[PDB]
């Protein structure tokens, strides 16, 4: 690595960056590139998992909370449950009854409810001082090796590149995690570039890179408060406390006009690989929340948004509002059995992101749907 408190990706397991990175143009060099056979992807994926796991080791497990919960809605509305339960204290011979609010998605019915992962694994809470804001990481070559960069403006995923430069290392890449739309990445320079391993298959994903960003405004409007509960000897749990004001639904805002222009251009370039057929877009076809919705980390909260309002159109020869859901117990990178609990964040949350690309798949008129939960495709 080369990069530059306590961020989840700032473990200082690797060096600082070069303040003045060098690049050498190789005149008259042709090199065959293939993004689908690029082992740098596997390397990044592994390092990201490691940094995540290292960062979550030194903190509190919530196994003491796997008790039966008594949950109601008596003071919440005219998705959120008010649950009471017993916990331990620093004195092993004492117990007390406490209250907390939980999101419905994290609680499963069986003295009515249980946390969703108590019969499968231990839930570790996020270490409370560790933020999840992406830090650009540069990947740099060891002695004896070199990294070559392709500079062809219209280069897609594979083939000869006629302009190759040697670099000490890559630009910083932000480890942004998302499931349907790509956020905060690089833009294409001249046109939308559609990259795929095999554009004619249905078994392969399509990565579409935009040359213009679309802003997405996301918010969590509820004024949630934080309550700190002592479980044991220096073992603290952070529970959602009460909510001040109205209960409102989390959502994201996308401009209607930019979205439509973006699709006209995506379709225009898709018709260059496909014959002049009708192209339609549909919502993700199925699976769990992680795949059917667009997820992201906004300020430390984990959002799941309904994108059916975007991928619903037919193409032939105002503001869009996406409702969202919030979860505290998550299982990243499809690792079953390794849940993490995100402590609630005090106050209202707002963030503005750049949609820089899309992940699309094809159904066996051509049909495209958003999707692909395999993180290697983002990288």
């Amino acid at each position, epitope marked *: 690595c080369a990069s530059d408190k306590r961020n989840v990706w700032a473990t200082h397991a690797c060096v600082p960056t070069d303040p003045n990175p060098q690049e050498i143009v190789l005149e008259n060099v042709t090199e065959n590139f293939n993004m689908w056979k690029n082992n740098m992807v596997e390397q990044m994926h592994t390092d990201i998992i490691s940094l995540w796991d290292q960062s979550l080791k030194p903190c509190v497990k919530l196994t003491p909370l796997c008790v039966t919960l008594n949950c109601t809605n008596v*003071n919440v*509305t*005219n998705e959120i449950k008010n649950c009471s339960f017993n916990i331990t204290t620093e004195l092993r011979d004492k117990k007390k009854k406490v209250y907390a609010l939980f999101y419905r998605l994290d609680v499963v019915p069986i003295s009515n409810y249980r946390l969703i992962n108590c019969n499968t694994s231990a839930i570790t809470q996020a270490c409370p001082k560790v933020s999840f804001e992406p830090i650009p990481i540069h990947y740099c070559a060891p002695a004896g090796f070199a990294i070559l960069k392709c500079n062809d403006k219209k280069f897609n995923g594979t083939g000869p590149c006629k302009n190759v430069s040697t670099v000490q290392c890559t630009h910083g890449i932000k480890p942004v995690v998302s499931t349907q739309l790509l956020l905060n990445g690089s833009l294409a320079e001249e046109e939308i570039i559609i990259r795929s391993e095999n554009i004619t298959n249905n078994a392969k994903t399509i990565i579409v890179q935009l040359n213009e960003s679309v802003e997405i405004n996301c918010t969590r409007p509820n004024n949630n408060t934080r309550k700190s509960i002592r479980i044991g000897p220096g073992q603290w749990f952070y529970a959602t406390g009460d909510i001040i*004001g109205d*209960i*409102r639904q989390a959502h994201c805002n996308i401009s209607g006009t930019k979205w439509n222009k973006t699709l006209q251009q995506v379709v225009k370039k898709l018709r260059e690989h496909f014959n002049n057929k009708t192209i339609i877009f549909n919502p993700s076809s199925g699976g769990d929340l992680e795949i059917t919705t667009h997820s992201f980390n906004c300020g430390g909260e984990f959002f799941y948004c309904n994108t059916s309002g975007l991928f619903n159109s037919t193409w032939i020869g105002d503001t869009i509002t996406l409702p969202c859901r919030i979860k505290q117990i998550i299982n990243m990178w499809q690792r079953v059995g390794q849940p993490m609990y995100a402590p609630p964040i005090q106050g209202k949350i707002r963030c503005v992101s750049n949609i820089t690309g899309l992940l699309l798949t094809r159904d066996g008129t051509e049909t495209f749907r958003p999707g692909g939960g395999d993180m290697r495709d983002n990288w």
Partner: antibody, heavy 131, light 108 residues
Framework: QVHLQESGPGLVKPSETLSLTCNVS????????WSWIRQPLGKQPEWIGY???????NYNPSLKSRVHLSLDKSKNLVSLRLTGVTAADSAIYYC??????????????????????????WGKGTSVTVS | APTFVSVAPGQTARITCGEE??????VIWYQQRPGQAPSLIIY??????SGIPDRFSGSPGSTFGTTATLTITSVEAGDEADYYC????????????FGEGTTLIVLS
């Protein structure tokens, strides 16, 4: 100017049916929401329910099974019927028009709003005693 | 049932109602002259209907954690009435009853 003139039996006996009438004048019954309010002596008033056309009628949950409201468009009268009257039902009853509006606090598309009602035009009321 | 307050003529009266707000509200205030049907003074927190003077105003429904307040400035003899309050709240079931009111006593 709308005038609401009420009438009724005055005295009813326990377990009987109380039926009050609001004679509407200056407006037609079909163009207004109507509601009934009762005020036990010495107490703050209670909202019984409201009635209107297009099925927009609702009731105080404690009286839902006992109270029936209707609008007579031929007579321009508002009817209030309460059955199983007891000592607790002695009250001054009132006929009133109802206006409505909306309080919006969030996104309208997600229905983050509510309807509220208020009573602008009130009648004189009638005193009802249950023996 | 009612709360009793009193003011000298010309003084400002402060009338309160209900419990602390939980969510956004739309508070409706009514006035009852003894022996008469009540009438509306304020709806939607601060919108008075025609016929009600500027001396009658109320607290906003945009806040949380506080009770409803009716303010009557320059109180006169004609303001001696019970004041009632009906509160709608976005996080509560519909209130089918009025809360206990306040009797405003005008002195001298």
């Amino acid at each position: 100017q709308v005038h609401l003139q009420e009438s009724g039996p005055g005295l009813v006996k326990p377990s009987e049916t109380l039926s009050l009438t609001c004679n509407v004048s200056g407006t037609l019954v079909r163009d207004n929401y109507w509601s009934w309010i009762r005020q036990p002596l010495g107490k703050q008033p209670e909202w019984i329910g409201y009635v209107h056309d297009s099925g927009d009628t609702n009731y105080n949950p404690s009286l839902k099974s006992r109270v029936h409201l209707s609008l007579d468009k031929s007579k321009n009268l508002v009817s209030l019927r309460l059955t199983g009257v007891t000592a607790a039902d002695s009250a001054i009853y009132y006929c009133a028009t109802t206006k409505h509006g909306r309080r919006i606090y969030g996104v309208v598309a997600f229905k983050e709003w509510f309807t509220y009602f208020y009573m602008d035009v009130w009648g004189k009321g009638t005193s009802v005693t249950v023996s | 049932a009612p709360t009793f307050v009193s003011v000298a003529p010309g003084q400002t009266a402060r009338i309160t109602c209900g419990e602390e707000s939980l969510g956004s509200r739309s508070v409706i205030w009514y006035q009852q002259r003894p022996g008469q049907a009540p009438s509306l003074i304020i709806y939607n927190n601060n919108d008075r209907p025609s016929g009600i003077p500027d001396r009658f105003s109320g607290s906003p429904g945009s806040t949380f954690g506080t009770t409803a307040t009716l303010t009557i400035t320059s109180v006169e003899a004609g303001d001696e009435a019970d004041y009632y309050c009906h509160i709608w709240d976005s996080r509560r079931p519909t209130n089918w009853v009025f809360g206990e009111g306040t009797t405003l006593i005008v002195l001298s």
